[PDB]
Amino acid sequence: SRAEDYEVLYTIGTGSYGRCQKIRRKSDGKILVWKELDYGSMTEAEKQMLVSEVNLLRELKHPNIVRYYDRIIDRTNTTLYIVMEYCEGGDLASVITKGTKERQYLDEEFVLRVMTQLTLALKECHRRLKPANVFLDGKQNVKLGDFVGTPYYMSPEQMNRNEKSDIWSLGCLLYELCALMPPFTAFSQKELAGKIREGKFRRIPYRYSDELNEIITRMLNLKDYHRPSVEEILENPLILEHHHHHH
Ligand SMILES: N#Cc1nc(Nc2ccccc2)nc2[nH]cnc12
């Protein structure tokens, strides 16, 4: 409830809203993180918005969604700390970078794990997305977290004016995991939007099964109503028990 109940171990990374720090909970020694949000220049209406968003994250409990634990206020520095689960395997952006630099494609079994567990995370989100926002724990489990950049994962419909848009994004992510590059690449957003609207891309590398290529390709269909639902994804014969989470 107070920042003094935790000890900062070190800064994991400085993100958009502030730092992500690895912390230790004094009571039991539990390793967590917290995100540092400088609410200094808010904004009573904005602060109410933030409190409500924090509430609904407080209620999002799922093995494939980064767990919320606590929120702490420290007026001495205009900083709100969001205490969350620590994912010791890091984010997927780093996995993709490691693959690119070491010129080593990822195992199809890993891609099926990501597909399975992120589809389940999305199922929960729809009930109740890029490599940097997807984390691995220590037991092979996958957890969904949360102007200069290129919207590589932007779907055609969301580019004109939708849970199927999430399916398109997941397709882009799985494709990038397989090919170590996004399906649509360009140097300007006009070129990128053109490529996205045409919906053509290279097959994922041939070391990946036709079945995996087929489901990712379906997720990348230009028409949202042709992309598979979460339910249709999880029905795929590729997806087995061992691809799900395990405590
Ligand atoms: N930012 C961030 C962040 N990072 C981790 N773990 C991690 C471990 C090694 C390398 C990189 C990341 N876990 C998190 N949970 C919520 N935010 C998290």
From Swiss-Prot:
Cofactor requirements of the protein:
Mg(2+)
> Any known activators or inhibitors?
Isoform 1 is inhibited by ionizing radiation in the presence of PPP1CA. Its catalytic activity is inhibited by the inhibitor CCT241950. In the presence of this inhibitor, displays an autoinhibited conformation: Tyr-68 side chain points into the active site, interacts with the activation loop, and blocks the alphaC helix.
Signal sequence, renumbered to the chain: none
Q: Name one GO biological process term.
A: cell division
Outcome of mutating S209D? Loss of kinase activity
Q: In which tissues is it expressed?
A: Isoform 1 and isoform 2 are expressed in peripheral blood T-cells and a wide variety of transformed cell types. Isoform 1 and isoform 4 are expressed in the testis. Up-regulated in various cancer cell lines, as well as primary breast tumors.
Tell me which EC number(s) this protein carries.
2.7.11.1
| Phosphoserine, modified sites | S155, S209
| Catalytic activity line of the entry | L-seryl-[protein] + ATP = O-phospho-L-seryl-[protein] + ADP + H(+); L-threonyl-[protein] + ATP = O-phospho-L-threonyl-[protein] + ADP + H(+)
Q: GO molecular function terms here?
A: ATP binding; metal ion binding; protein kinase activity; protein phosphatase binding; protein serine kinase activity; protein serine/threonine kinase activity
What does the record say about induction? Expression and activity peak in the G2 phase of the mitotic cycle and decrease once the cells have entered mitosis due to degradation by the anaphase promoting complex APC/C-CDC20. In G1 phase, both isoform 1 and isoform 2 are almost undetectable. However, at the G1/S transition, there is an increase in expression of both isoforms which then remain at this increased level throughout S and G2. At the onset of mitosis, isoform 1 undergoes a rapid disappearance whereas isoform 2 continues to be present at about the same level as in G2.
Q: Which UniProt keywords apply?
A: ATP-binding, Cell cycle, Cell division, Centromere, Chromosome, Chromosome partition, Coiled coil, Cytoplasm, Cytoskeleton, Kinase, Kinetochore, Magnesium, Meiosis, Metal-binding, Microtubule, Mitosis, Nucleotide-binding, Nucleus, Phosphoprotein, Retinitis pigmentosa, Serine/threonine-protein kinase, Transferase
**Record-listed Phosphothreonine modification sites:** T150
An example Gene Ontology CC term for this record: nucleus
- Keyword Secreted in the entry? The reply is no
Q: Where is the Protein kinase domain?
A: 6-239
**Effect of substituting S209A:** Loss of kinase activity
Modifications after synthesis and translation: Activated by autophosphorylation. Protein phosphatase 1 represses autophosphorylation and activation of isoform 1 by dephosphorylation. Phosphorylation by STK3/MST2 is necessary for its localization to the centrosome.
> From which domain of life does this come?
Eukaryota
Q: Which family does it belong to?
A: Belongs to the protein kinase superfamily. NEK Ser/Thr protein kinase family. NIMA subfamily.
What does the record's free text say on domains?
The leucine-zipper domain is required for its dimerization and activation.
Assembly? Isoform 1, isoform 2 and isoform 4 form homo- and heterodimers. Interacts with NECAB3 and HMGA2. Isoform 1 interacts with CDC20, CTNB1, MAD1L1, MAPK, NEK11, NPM1, NDC80, PCNT and SGO1. Isoform 1 interacts with STK3/MST2 (via SARAH domain) and SAV1 (via SARAH domain). Isoform 1 and isoform 2 interact with MAD2L1. Isoform 1 and isoform 4 interact with PPP1CA and PPP1CC. Interacts with CEP68; the interaction leads to phosphorylation of CEP68. Interacts with CNTLN; the interaction leads to phosphorylation of CNTLN. Isoform 1 interacts with CEP85.
Q: What is this protein called?
A: Serine/threonine-protein kinase Nek2
In the record, what lineage is assigned to the organism producing the protein? Eukaryota, Metazoa, Chordata, Craniata, Vertebrata
Q: Which gene encodes it?
A: NEK2
